[PDB]
Design a protein around this ligand. Structure first.
Ligand SMILES: [Cl-]
Ligand SMILES: [Cl-]
Ligand SMILES: [Cl-]
Ligand SMILES: [Cl-]
Ligand SMILES: [Cl-]
Ligand SMILES: [Cl-]
Ligand SMILES: [Cl-]
Ligand code: NA
Length: 129
């Protein structure tokens, strides 16, 4: 599914991401835009042989099992295919584990390079939330 900006903001708010570990909703929408272009089916392969999955590009090296990332962990305890669902619940629940992990949203390279220190409130402007 390719989300609209406000549709995704509303779904993330319903799933408890607004101010989760102090990150306002616009941070999460900004990260999703630049990681996946709001497409739940996005996949991208890394040089190390791991793959990033779904709207928040969660990596198979640590967070999910894809059956082809040798010596990887599965810290969210989910098959990586669950992260490609039109239902963002699995992505959101895993993202909460990631952002609790000690480097906050700096875990997301697109967030650090494209969202951090910008007016992220712009990403939820105009939305009925
Ligand atoms: Cl947009
Ligand atoms: Cl915000
Ligand atoms: Cl594996
Ligand atoms: Cl594991
Ligand atoms: Cl699993
Ligand atoms: Cl959803
Ligand atoms: Cl933090
Ligand atoms: Na894994």
């Amino acid at each position: 599914k390719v989300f609209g900006r406000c549709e995704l903001a509303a779904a993330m708010k319903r799933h408890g991401l607004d101010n989760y570990r102090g990150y306002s909703l616009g941070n999460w929408v900004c990260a999703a835009k630049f990681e996946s272009n709001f497409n739940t089916q996005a996949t991208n392969r890394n040089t190390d042989g791991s793959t990033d999955y779904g709207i928040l590009q969660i990596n198979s090296r640590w967070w999910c099992n894809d059956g082809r990332t040798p010596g990887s962990r599965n810290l969210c305890n989910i098959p990586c295919s669950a992260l490609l669902s039109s239902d963002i619940t699995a992505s959101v629940n895993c993202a909460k584990k990631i952002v609790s992990d000690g480097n906050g949203m700096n875990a997301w390279v697109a967030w650090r390079n494209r969202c951090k220190g910008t007016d992220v409130q712009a990403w939820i402007r105009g939305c009925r939330l």
